[PDB]
Amino acid sequence: TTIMAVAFKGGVVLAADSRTSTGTYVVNRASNKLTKLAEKIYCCRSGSAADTQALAEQTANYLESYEIDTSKPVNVTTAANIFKKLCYMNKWNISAGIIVAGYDPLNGGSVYSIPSGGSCVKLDYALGGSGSIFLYSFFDANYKTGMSKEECVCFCQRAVAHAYSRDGSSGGLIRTIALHQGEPEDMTIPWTKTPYCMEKDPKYRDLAVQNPPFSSSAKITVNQSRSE
């Protein structure tokens, strides 16, 4: 799994891959890991599918009740706090890394990270899942604050493509959603139009020379392609 969320000027972008696997076999190649918690607040889910589905549903139930009781739309910080409490009270019996992100008019676009263990950290961007390890350096080199909404969608699509080209446990579609004061905008990129993969990178077109033909010299040239 590869998940992330990034803040921009006046909102957030969430992004993910679409693969669910038992280790070496793909059970679903088109999962949806961006789960809605309220009109402008979403989470990204990693770890056990069963545990994350169950805690997202419970968090959403509590936010809907709260919103009816106050007659106002909820803030991102309230969703993060409710979710944190469920992750922390159940930490020994679950496998879950969560990112909560969204837009509200008090604080604008906000991103919170809730990793294994149940801590809660407020950031400018967050990464999660098996594929995150491939992206720390990509962001350290190429991320800046103050990107526009279109810059930020394009950047997150590229980041997800890099992680899934190297991580066997990620793959498939790239899903994104952008949350701001207007309406939410979702997008799905198919593998055939991915912005990066190893299979089409020209520096990996020519094969390594592992199988040189039997020769009278120690010079290494080409791979054998036909029987002698």
């Binding site: 549903e57 139930n61 809907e64 009740s65 009816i68 009781d69 007659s71």
Partner: protein, 244 residues
């Protein structure tokens, strides 16, 4: 003795249930609901006697969820306790079955809360009529249809084409019965339905109404949500009535 607890009198009746219905009129306000072709509307008196009260904090209308509204008529704090229990019920239903509760199902669940107190001793009946409003889907074509359901203190639960509840309800119902004879309410437009509801209020109160004296709620085929209608939209229905 039969006057003080829930046991039967010799004629087969329950007096605490009769007296809980007088609590509904004692409160002194009148409500009217009506269903037309594409919507359901509810008109209730907004009473702010004291000049120092902040009018936007006094309401008889509340959302149970996004798509269902209530109007309370009778003893006001009793009605707020039933709003909280209904909210809880609608949220348990959604957890268990994974979909929002239909308005006919919710009304029946609240009607069962009431029946339990007519049959067990020691908790006072709630002296209110609750009216529930919302759109419901047909299984045949998938089209949506508006509904009104009322729940009374005895635990009775019923659906209406139009209903008046509260002080002078007898005179306001008579009035709507006459008007029904012309055209069934399910053929009418919003405007024509509204002119009948506002005329019934006025006739029964024996007074003239401004927009600030009524608060109005609505659900429609166009927008399922239960929402308060803006004062400007009400003014134009009253203006339209004053002409004719």
């Amino acid at each position: 003795f039969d006057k003080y607890i829930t046991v039967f009198s010799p004629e087969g009746s329950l007096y605490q249930v009769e007296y809980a219905f007088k609590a509904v009129t004692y409160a002194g306000l009148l409500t009217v609901a009506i269903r037309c072709k594409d919507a359901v509307l509810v008109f209730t008196q907004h009473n702010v006697p004291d000049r120092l009260m902040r009018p936007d904090t006094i309401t008889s209308l509340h959302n149970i969820n996004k798509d269902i509204g209530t109007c309370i008529t009778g003893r006001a704090p009793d009605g707020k306790s039933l709003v909280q229990k209904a909210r809880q019920e609608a949220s348990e239903y959604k957890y268990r079955y994974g979909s929002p509760i239909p308005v006919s199902v919710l009304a029946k669940r609240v009607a069962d809360m009431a029946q339990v107190r007519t049959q067990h001793a020691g908790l006072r009946l709630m002296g209110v009529v609750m009216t529930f409003l919302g759109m419901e889907q047909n299984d045949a074509d998938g089209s949506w249809v508006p509904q009104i359901y009322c729940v009374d203190p005895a635990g009775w639960c019923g659906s209406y084409h139009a209903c008046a509840i509260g002080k002078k309800q007898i005179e306001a119902n008579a009035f709507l019965e006459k008007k029904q004879k012309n055209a069934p309410f399910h053929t009418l437009s919003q405007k024509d339905a509204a002119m009948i509801a506002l005329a019934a209020l006025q006739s029964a109160l024996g007074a003239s109404l401004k927009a600030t004296d009524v608060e109005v709620g609505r659900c429609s085929v166009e927008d399922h949500c239960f929402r308060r209608v803006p004062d400007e939209d009400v003014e134009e229905w009253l203006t339209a009535l004053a002409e004719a």
